[PDB]
Amino acid sequence: HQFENVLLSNRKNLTPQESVQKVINYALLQDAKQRSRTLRHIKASWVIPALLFTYPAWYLAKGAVN
Amino acid sequence: VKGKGSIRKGIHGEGFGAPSHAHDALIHQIKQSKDTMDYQNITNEVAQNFANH
Amino acid sequence: KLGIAPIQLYKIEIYKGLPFLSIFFYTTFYFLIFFLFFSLLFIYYLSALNNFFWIILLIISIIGIFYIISIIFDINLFKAFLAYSTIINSISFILLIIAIIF
Amino acid sequence: LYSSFKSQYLLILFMTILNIFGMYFYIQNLRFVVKKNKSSILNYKNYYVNINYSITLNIILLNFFNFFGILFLSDLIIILNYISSYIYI
Amino acid sequence: RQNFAKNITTTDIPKDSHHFAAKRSGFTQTEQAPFAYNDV
Amino acid sequence: DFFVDKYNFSRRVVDHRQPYDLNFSINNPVGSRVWFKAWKQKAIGNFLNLVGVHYAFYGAG
Amino acid sequence: SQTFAHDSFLGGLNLFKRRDPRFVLDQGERPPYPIINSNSSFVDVLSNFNKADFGLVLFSAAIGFPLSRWVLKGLTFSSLNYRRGLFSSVYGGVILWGLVLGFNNSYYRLNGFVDNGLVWKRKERKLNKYDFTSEFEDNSFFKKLRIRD
Amino acid sequence: MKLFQAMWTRTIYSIGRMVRETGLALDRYGCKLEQDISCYEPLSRHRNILPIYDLVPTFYHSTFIAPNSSLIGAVYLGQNTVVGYGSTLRGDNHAIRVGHNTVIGDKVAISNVATLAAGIPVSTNIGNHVNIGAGCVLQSCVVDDNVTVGHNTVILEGSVLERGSVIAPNSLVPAGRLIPSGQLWAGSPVRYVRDLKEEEIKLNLEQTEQNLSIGKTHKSSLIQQEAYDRL
Amino acid sequence: KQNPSFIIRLNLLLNSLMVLYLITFNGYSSTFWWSHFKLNNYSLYMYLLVIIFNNYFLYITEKHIKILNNYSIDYFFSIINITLFIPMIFLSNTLFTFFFLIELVSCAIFYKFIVSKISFKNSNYKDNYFSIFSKNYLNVLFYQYWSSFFSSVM
Amino acid sequence: LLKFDPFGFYSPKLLSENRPEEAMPFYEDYPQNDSHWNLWEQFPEDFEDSNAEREAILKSNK
Amino acid sequence: TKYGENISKHRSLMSLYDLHPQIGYQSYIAPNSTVIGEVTIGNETTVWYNSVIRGDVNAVQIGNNVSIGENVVIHTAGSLPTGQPASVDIGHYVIIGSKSTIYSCTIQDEVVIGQGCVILEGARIEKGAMIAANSVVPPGRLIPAGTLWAGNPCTFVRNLTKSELATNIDHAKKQLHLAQQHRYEYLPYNSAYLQKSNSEEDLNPTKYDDVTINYNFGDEERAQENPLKY
Amino acid sequence: MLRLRLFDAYEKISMTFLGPLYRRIGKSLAQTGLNIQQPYTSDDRLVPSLRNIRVTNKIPSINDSEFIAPNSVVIGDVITKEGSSIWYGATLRGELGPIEIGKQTVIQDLVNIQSGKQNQKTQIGDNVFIGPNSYIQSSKINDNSFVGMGSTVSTGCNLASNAVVAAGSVVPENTQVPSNQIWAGSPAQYLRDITPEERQVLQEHHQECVQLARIHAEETEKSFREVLNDFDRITAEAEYDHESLALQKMRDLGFPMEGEEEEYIEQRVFMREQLPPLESEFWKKNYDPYEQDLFHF
Amino acid sequence: AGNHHHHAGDQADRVADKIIWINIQNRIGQFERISAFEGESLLEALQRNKVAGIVATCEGGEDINTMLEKPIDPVTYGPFCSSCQVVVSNPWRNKMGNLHYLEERNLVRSSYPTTENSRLACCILVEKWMNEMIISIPQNPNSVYEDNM
Numbered sequence A: 001h002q003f004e005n006v007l008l009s010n011r012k013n014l015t016p017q018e019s020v021q022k023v024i025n026y027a028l029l030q031d032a033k034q035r036s037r038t039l040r041h042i043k044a045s046w047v048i049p050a051l052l053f054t055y056p057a058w059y060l061a062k063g064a065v066n
Numbered sequence B: 001v002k003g004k005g006s007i008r009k010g011i012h013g014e015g016f017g018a019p020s021h022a023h024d025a026l027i028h029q030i031k032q033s034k035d036t037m038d039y040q041n042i043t044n045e046v047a048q049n050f051a052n053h
Numbered sequence C: 001k002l003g004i005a006p007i008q009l010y011k012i013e014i015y016k017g018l019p020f021l022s023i024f025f026y027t028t029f030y031f032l033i034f035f036l037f038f039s040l041l042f043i044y045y046l047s048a049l050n051n052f053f054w055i056i057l058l059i060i061s062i063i064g065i066f067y068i069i070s071i072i073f074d075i076n077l078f079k080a081f082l083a084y085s086t087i088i089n090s091i092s093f094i095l096l097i098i099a100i101i102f
Numbered sequence D: 001l002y003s004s005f006k007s008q009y010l011l012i013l014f015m016t017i018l019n020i021f022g023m024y025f026y027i028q029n030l031r032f033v034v035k036k037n038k039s040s041i042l043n044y045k046n047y048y049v050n051i052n053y054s055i056t057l058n059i060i061l062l063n064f065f066n067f068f069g070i071l072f073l074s075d076l077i078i079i080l081n082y083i084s085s086y087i088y089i
Numbered sequence E: 001r002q003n004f005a006k007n008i009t010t011t012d013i014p015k016d017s018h019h020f021a022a023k024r025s026g027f028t029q030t031e032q033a034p035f036a037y038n039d040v
Numbered sequence F: 001d002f003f004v005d006k007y008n009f010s011r012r013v014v015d016h017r018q019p020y021d022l023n024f025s026i027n028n029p030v031g032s033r034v035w036f037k038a039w040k041q042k043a044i045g046n047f048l049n050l051v052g053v054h055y056a057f058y059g060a061g
Numbered sequence G: 001s002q003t004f005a006h007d008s009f010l011g012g013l014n015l016f017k018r019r020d021p022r023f024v025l026d027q028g029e030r031p032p033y034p035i036i037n038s039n040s041s042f043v044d045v046l047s048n049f050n051k052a053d054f055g056l057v058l059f060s061a062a063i064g065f066p067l068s069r070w071v072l073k074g075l076t077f078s079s080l081n082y083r084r085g086l087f088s089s090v091y092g093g094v095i096l097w098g099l100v101l102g103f104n105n106s107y108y109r110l111n112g113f114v115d116n117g118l119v120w121k122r123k124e125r126k127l128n129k130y131d132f133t134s135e136f137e138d139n140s141f142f143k144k145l146r147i148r149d
Numbered sequence H: 001m002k003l004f005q006a007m008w009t010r011t012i013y014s015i016g017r018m019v020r021e022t023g024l025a026l027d028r029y030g031c032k033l034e035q036d037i038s039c040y041e042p043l044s045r046h047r048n049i050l051p052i053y054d055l056v057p058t059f060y061h062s063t064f065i066a067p068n069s070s071l072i073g074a075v076y077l078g079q080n081t082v083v084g085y086g087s088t089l090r091g092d093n094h095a096i097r098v099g100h101n102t103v104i105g106d107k108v109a110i111s112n113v114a115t116l117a118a119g120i121p122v123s124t125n126i127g128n129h130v131n132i133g134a135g136c137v138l139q140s141c142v143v144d145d146n147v148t149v150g151h152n153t154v155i156l157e158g159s160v161l162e163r164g165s166v167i168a169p170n171s172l173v174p175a176g177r178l179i180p181s182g183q184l185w186a187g188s189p190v191r192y193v194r195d196l197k198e199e200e201i202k203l204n205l206e207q208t209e210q211n212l213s214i215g216k217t218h219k220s221s222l223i224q225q226e227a228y229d230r231l
Numbered sequence I: 001k002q003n004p005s006f007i008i009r010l011n012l013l014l015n016s017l018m019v020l021y022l023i024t025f026n027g028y029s030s031t032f033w034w035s036h037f038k039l040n041n042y043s044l045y046m047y048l049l050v051i052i053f054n055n056y057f058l059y060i061t062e063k064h065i066k067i068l069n070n071y072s073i074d075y076f077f078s079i080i081n082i083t084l085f086i087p088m089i090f091l092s093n094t095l096f097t098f099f100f101l102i103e104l105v106s107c108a109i110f111y112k113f114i115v116s117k118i119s120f121k122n123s124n125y126k127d128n129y130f131s132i133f134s135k136n137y138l139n140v141l142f143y144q145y146w147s148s149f150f151s152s153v154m
Numbered sequence J: 001l002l003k004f005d006p007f008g009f010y011s012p013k014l015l016s017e018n019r020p021e022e023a024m025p026f027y028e029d030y031p032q033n034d035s036h037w038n039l040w041e042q043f044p045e046d047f048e049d050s051n052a053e054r055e056a057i058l059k060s061n062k
Numbered sequence K: 001t002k003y004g005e006n007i008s009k010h011r012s013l014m015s016l017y018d019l020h021p022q023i024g025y026q027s028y029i030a031p032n033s034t035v036i037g038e039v040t041i042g043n044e045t046t047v048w049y050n051s052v053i054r055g056d057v058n059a060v061q062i063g064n065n066v067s068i069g070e071n072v073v074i075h076t077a078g079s080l081p082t083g084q085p086a087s088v089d090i091g092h093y094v095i096i097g098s099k100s101t102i103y104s105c106t107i108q109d110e111v112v113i114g115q116g117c118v119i120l121e122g123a124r125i126e127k128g129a130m131i132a133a134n135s136v137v138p139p140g141r142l143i144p145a146g147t148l149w150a151g152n153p154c155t156f157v158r159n160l161t162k163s164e165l166a167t168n169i170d171h172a173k174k175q176l177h178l179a180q181q182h183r184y185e186y187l188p189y190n191s192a193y194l195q196k197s198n199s200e201e202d203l204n205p206t207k208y209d210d211v212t213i214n215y216n217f218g219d220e221e222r223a224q225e226n227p228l229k230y
Numbered sequence L: 001m002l003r004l005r006l007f008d009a010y011e012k013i014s015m016t017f018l019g020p021l022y023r024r025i026g027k028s029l030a031q032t033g034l035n036i037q038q039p040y041t042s043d044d045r046l047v048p049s050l051r052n053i054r055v056t057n058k059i060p061s062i063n064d065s066e067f068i069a070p071n072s073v074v075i076g077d078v079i080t081k082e083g084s085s086i087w088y089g090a091t092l093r094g095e096l097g098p099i100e101i102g103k104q105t106v107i108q109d110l111v112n113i114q115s116g117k118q119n120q121k122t123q124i125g126d127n128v129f130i131g132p133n134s135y136i137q138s139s140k141i142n143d144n145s146f147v148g149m150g151s152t153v154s155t156g157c158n159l160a161s162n163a164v165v166a167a168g169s170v171v172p173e174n175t176q177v178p179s180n181q182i183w184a185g186s187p188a189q190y191l192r193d194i195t196p197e198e199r200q201v202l203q204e205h206h207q208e209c210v211q212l213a214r215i216h217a218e219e220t221e222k223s224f225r226e227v228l229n230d231f232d233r234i235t236a237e238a239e240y241d242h243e244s245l246a247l248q249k250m251r252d253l254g255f256p257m258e259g260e261e262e263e264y265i266e267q268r269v270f271m272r273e274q275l276p277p278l279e280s281e282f283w284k285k286n287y288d289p290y291e292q293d294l295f296h297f
Numbered sequence M: 001a002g003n004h005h006h007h008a009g010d011q012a013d014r015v016a017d018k019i020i021w022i023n024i025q026n027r028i029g030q031f032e033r034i035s036a037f038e039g040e041s042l043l044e045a046l047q048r049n050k051v052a053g054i055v056a057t058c059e060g061g062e063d064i065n066t067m068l069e070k071p072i073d074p075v076t077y078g079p080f081c082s083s084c085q086v087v088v089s090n091p092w093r094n095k096m097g098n099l100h101y102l103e104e105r106n107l108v109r110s111s112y113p114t115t116e117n118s119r120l121a122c123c124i125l126v127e128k129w130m131n132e133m134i135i136s137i138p139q140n141p142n143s144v145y146e147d148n149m
């Protein structure tokens, strides 16, 4: 529902085992989100050059060999 | 040492060559006893020069 | 003058002793002027004497090829490699010149 | 091709012998090109290796022409024949 | 070597966390520290 | 003017590396009195160094 | 209509307008324009100078400044006096080259090679049997650089 | 679409970079023409907050970050976290997260490994009231709240420290190991020592509070002396 | 220690001016100056090709010199003389003038070899007080001189 | 051979592939199949990946 | 007075009157890091933040594609008792952990040094060896190739397998892309000078020098391979 | 006349008009590009100088020091005596407690001094040496003490004069190190007694580091113009030849450097008399020609 | 790994006990003493110790199929020059044994005088039995122009 920062939340009431497990799960989820974001940025960096320079390359090759 | 390339200064003085290089007896003699020779000492270099001649 | 296969060792020595930039300029001068004029001697300038030039060119080419076939694999220097590349190209161009004057 | 046009089979034979010998002469150096590690052959300027953009650009143009000379060779052949036609031989 | 990410989000990896248990008391001065992850 | 968010649009450091002959008399515009004085000194010195060369060149021309 | 007036300051641009890519005409081929003086000496060539040659010299003077500075930009360990002297030498060389170009233009106008303001009474018209450039020039910028009868 | 948004962001970033390049080149050329040596001056290019594209460090303004330190990549600081002088949080391959009232000593280095086995996070996570001494090294380790790590301590990958654990200085925590709560561990390979007492816990809490106060005083003094950028 | 980049740029500039002169050149196809020089399309094209190649090589050499300077101003003055006098060979109309032009070019090339740099300031500090003999300079000069002698006499 | 069981069907396999030993880093065991024909990491459709931590911290900072 | 100023006078690269450091291509030296003296850095070598490398007392050789780490101090010794050269030599694909100190030593290729190690003068670590994080290699000690040592003083543990060697090499190769990612954030032109205020010395020099040569001569043609270049 | 006048006119026009215009355009473009790149970019900053930092009236007294690294950190109550040296990356947080450094005391790179107590002071004697990556918390180090690389001195320690701590040694908290004793290991323990040769080499190393501190200070403490001149000199030397180097040495010695001055060469090369030998050269025990000692051969 | 006799918990051996001592007569007739290790070439040891009198134009030769391999591969190209010659005393020369044909070819092709005990440092591989080996190093020839650089 609403974003909760488990690392910055209060976990004193819970046992140390539960606290560490919650921290680990939150870290894994946030790492997955960061991984998705960086992968999307890499995909955009792949797509941009293709769209920009595919037609110019075909034009150059077509002019060269025809 | 300023202006002497890789030559570096020791505690009691400054060397006459780069760190790992070999010390030269002839150069040491020239520096320490410049212009002075009690006798014409026949070193290995002198003997080899004589043989080559 | 040029340093063609029959007389090449002096060219190898010169290339060994010259700097890379000197070789860079000398190869250009040589190929683009000296060898081109050497070819034009048989093609355009002294074409009337081709009835004598053909045999001399053939003999020179054969001797140079059979003399360098083994030498080019005996060198161990970058300058020697460059010089012998030049020499091999010169021999090939001499063969082409013979074909042209035919 | 010109040797064949002029009908010089012996010249073709000797050209081919020289070509193959020189081909191996050039190729054998690729064996030495192999190195245990990456070499450091660049001059240092301002504490860093000096890489010349102008020479790299010239080398790139030369590489492009070396790779694709066959495509544009017709124009160069036309130009060379045009230059040579002025000679009346 | 392999550079893919183990922790996938498409699904939760099946696991059992009871086969291996980490000691948390009664240690000695010569015993090594226990292992944090014990899921199989 | 003098300063923006972070860049000083009036930033300036004078180049201390200047040629020694800057402000010399010879460097003054040709035809000026200072330039004429410097050139006269230079010509006198050159003639004294090479009397024969100055003759053979200038007189011949 | 295709070439600048030979008596104008821009009359020196006709050197770049050529009918064919050849260097020289054949021994016997009539020049494109009437011959004013075939056996031209140095004095008469100089006397034949024109506003076109003066404009060529002015172009050389204008273009020798950027070129002189470009040459000077590769100079190091140089005093101000030597730098100024080198600039003067390069600029004078460029101006002398411009003078040579003007002299050659005057010689060409005398010999009829370039437009000298005269036209043959009867033009010798070719048959454009081989034409790889007429349409290209018409649809391109290079129609200005070529002269067609 | 998210992909289109990312492509537009990359395009605008590249345009901005090209604009900066051309502007700086024009400035240098103008300096050359004007005989100005301002551009040539060699000045340290060190940047305290170095954001990798899409990975910008984030920290509450209440935090004190030493100007000598360097935060890089995905770093996350809490409310009153303190970073010592010369300590670097590289956090470029993965993210680094810190708690509200933690203290990081001087010369502390934190950097996470490329990858780890399944179920082990590859990011450094630190509790709320953690106190880390100067000269410590951390790599993809999890630390719970109220943890004190002695000076010159090395903590390797997959190492989990529970709440209240104490590690003596000059000790190393082997990778993929657990330090239970309320226990003291010492030695180059950590070995069990004893269970902490209430007095020791109170002393550690007071020490971390004192470190936080000292960090606040340092921030105030640096802002006064113009050594701290007023973010 | 002046860098010869300005000399190289001057050579490039004057080569470009000569190219402009060739492009704007006009005249009849014939010989000039006592039938010792030929002026025809093929010879002029050879001259232009030589000039263009020399210009390109000079440009590359200028870039290399900017990279590093191990060549003196006399080296590039010799290159200037070679570039100025070598394309004139294709304008030769007689073997006599060809021989004289090639002799001049050979003298220029010998000058270039003479002005080759000999001693370098390398990182070898072991030969400070020992004699090292290198015969490359003398070998180059000897072979060039005697090959030129034989070719000239023949 | 009897002990050998890289997969966890017969002998239990830790999610952490191996037990790290002291004085060594923690590295994954080399898999039995080392094929590199692997796609980029796949995520569920409409996966939420907004930088919630950064957004919250920026909102608090104002 | 002597040390009173607002802007730091620190430079990453420095020399002492004859000792110019040399750095290869794609090698990233952090702005915090200091590299002073006769120090040679190979290709693709990465030196992280707050690392000191002093070749002032003797030469320092660094191989290709090596990682130095953070808070690492590398320095030489005047001489060795055995008479061997006291220069620091580090081979290719060598990884040095953070908080470590390297004296005059001989580290061969594919060697991995843990975090906080202390290698003393005269030590010779052979190819492929590994060292525990908090271990000390005493002076004049030989660590055999492909062996594991740990503790203070270091003691043998076991031999290393081809898999371990390959993993170490892979990590060394993997550091390169992170180094390049850090590198890409710096533009070739420094903009710090634009943030200073003109002073009397800047506006009017006290003394003038003769124009000899500009250190950035031909930089209009030189490629900006390394952004952190003066 | 005309050519040189045009050259001067163009030079003045360029320097006075094009320079400022290009500078302004470039600065505006740089600002625009940075604004476009934000928030995913960072710009260069004026790194603050953390030497001599004052906190709550605590003013460091380090003016009487030979070398202080520009990137080092000195904060609060830090007093240093004449000849002391603090090297790159060293952090001296004196607000935790007073930090006293004696005369000719060397502190190498990445050395952190921090008092673990609230106000306990750190006192370091004269001729003390602390190696790189060392960590002193709070202790009494007497004069002529040596601390090795990567060595940690804990709180309450007291090591007397001529006490050696081996590199990589962790001194236990509240430990006394007698004089002329070597302590090594972790935890540190007594190993043996310092020999005269070991003491001599330690003293020589300390003196060498003290001398090298002067060179480091001279290098670091340079103006921007001086650094630019150094860069220009290095670039020029990259292309200077043997003749140029010989001319440099000749002009330093005072030889003629002009054609008209060539006629007074003898007055500068030969006429000047040679300095007479020092009288100490006449008291050498032996005058036999030097030869390599062939012991061990 | 291998070629060592260490057990779990043992201390590392001293480099002093492992260094192999080589005694040299320099080109100037003086005596030098250097240290090397087994597994590296005598040329590498001499260059590391910076012994004068060796040019090493080829700098050890090829990096594959090298002469240092105990079984020399027949497809080896051998040394690429003869600028690292060293005269080895008979007691160790006899142990070294007969020359490889490529090495002998290069030695005889050397421009300077050669001795029956001459050998190439790059082709020599350091061994334990070479301890206290005595050699002489006269000056080697300079092959090409690049040597001066």
Ligand SMILES: CCCCCCCCCCCCCCCCCC(=O)OC[C@H](COP(=O)([O-])OCC(O)COP(=O)([O-])OC[C@@H](COC(=O)CCCCCCCCCCCCCCCCC)OC(=O)CCCCCCCCCCCCCCCCC)OC(=O)CCCCCCCCCCCCCCCCC
Pocket: D054, D057, D061, D062, D065, D068, D069, D070, D072, D073, D075, D076, G021, G022, G023, I022, I023, I052, I053, I054, I055, I056, I057, I059, K220, K221
């Ligand atoms: C199939 C086989 C084919 C084999 C091909 C063999 C050759 C291939 C490689 C070489 C080809 C030439 C490349 C261009 C010259 C090199 C310099 C250059 O321009 O780059 C530097 C310059 C780099 O600038 P920068 O990085 O911004 O700053 C550099 C310095 O900071 C600042 O620079 P700067 O201030 O020092 O100098 C700036 C100046 C520098 O420029 C130069 O100084 C040029 C140097 C070369 C001079 C010789 C050129 C000759 C051209 C004619 C064709 C022959 C080519 C021979 C090439 C090899 C000879 C050894 O730049 C220019 O102005 C460049 C202009 C280039 C065009 C010149 C055209 C001249 C024509 C003259 C003849 C006309 C016909 C007459 C007919 C007569 C009939 C009667 O490059 C550019 O500005 C553009 C670079 C990218 C585009 C390059 C396009 C090249 C096109 C080549 C076409 C070739 C012919 C057509 C194909 C033929 C086969 C089908």
Ligand SMILES: CCCCCCCCCCCCCCCCCC(=O)OC[C@H](COP(=O)([O-])OCC(O)COP(=O)([O-])OC[C@@H](COC(=O)CCCCCCCCCCCCCCCCC)OC(=O)CCCCCCCCCCCCCCCCC)OC(=O)CCCCCCCCCCCCCCCCC
Pocket: F042, F046, F050, F053, F054, F056, F057, F058, F060, F061, G043, G046
């Ligand atoms: C017959 C036997 C041969 C000898 C004959 C005489 C030759 C005289 C030539 C000029 C000599 C200049 C003075 C040299 C002194 C040397 C001693 C000295 O000062 O030592 C210290 C001197 C250093 O001190 P410095 O102060 O820096 O230099 C000395 C002077 O201060 C600054 O040095 P600077 O050189 O820069 O200053 C020279 C400037 C001196 O500056 C001044 O005094 C003020 C400037 C005066 C400008 C005068 C220009 C007048 C132009 C008249 C144009 C009329 C055309 C009319 C057209 C028709 C109109 C309708 O003088 C000039 O401007 C002379 C130009 C005269 C041109 C005359 C043209 C006559 C054409 C005849 C044919 C006409 C045919 C068509 C007729 C149509 C009629 C209808 O040492 C040097 O390093 C000097 C080096 C000078 C080298 C000169 C040679 C360069 C060329 C070498 C070529 C090598 C061979 C390759 C080419 C092959 C053919 C040659």
Ligand SMILES: CCCCCCCCCCCCCCCCCC(=O)OC[C@H](COP(=O)([O-])OCC[N+](C)(C)C)OC(=O)CCCCCCCCCCCCCCCCC
Pocket: G041, G042, G043, G044, I085, I088, I101, I104
């Ligand atoms: C490979 C090497 C390079 C290429 C090959 C080399 C070629 C060598 C052969 C060249 C022959 C050139 C002969 C030209 C003769 C005609 C000259 C001419 O146009 O004169 C027209 C004019 C005559 O024009 P005219 O011919 O019209 O006049 C006669 C007119 N009628 C018939 C109507 C009466 O000549 C003169 O008046 C002057 C004659 C020469 C006077 C003496 C000059 C000496 C100069 C010495 C050098 C000075 C250097 C100064 C330097 C200053 C700066 C430092």
Ligand SMILES: CCCCCCCCCCCCCCCCCC(=O)OC[C@H](COP(=O)([O-])OCC[N+](C)(C)C)OC(=O)CCCCCCCCCCCCCCCCC
Pocket: G010, G013, G016, G063, G066, G067, G070, G073, I012, I013, I016, I017, I020, K220
């Ligand atoms: C209908 C009415 C029409 C009216 C037309 C009136 C105008 C007629 C003239 C037009 C001239 C056009 C430009 C010509 C070339 C200018 C070159 C220039 O200034 O560059 C400086 C530049 C100098 O550099 P730079 O000024 O670009 O800056 C250098 C900056 N660094 C060094 C940092 C890179 O010149 C060169 O670089 C050239 C070097 C080699 C030498 C080449 C010589 C070429 C000579 C050309 C002569 C003119 C030919 C005209 C052909 C006309 C055909 C129709």
Ligand code: FES
Pocket: M043, M056, M057, M058, M059, M060, M061, M079, M080, M081, M082, M083, M084, M120, M121, M122, M123
């Ligand atoms: S180094 Fe060339 S053969 Fe030995």
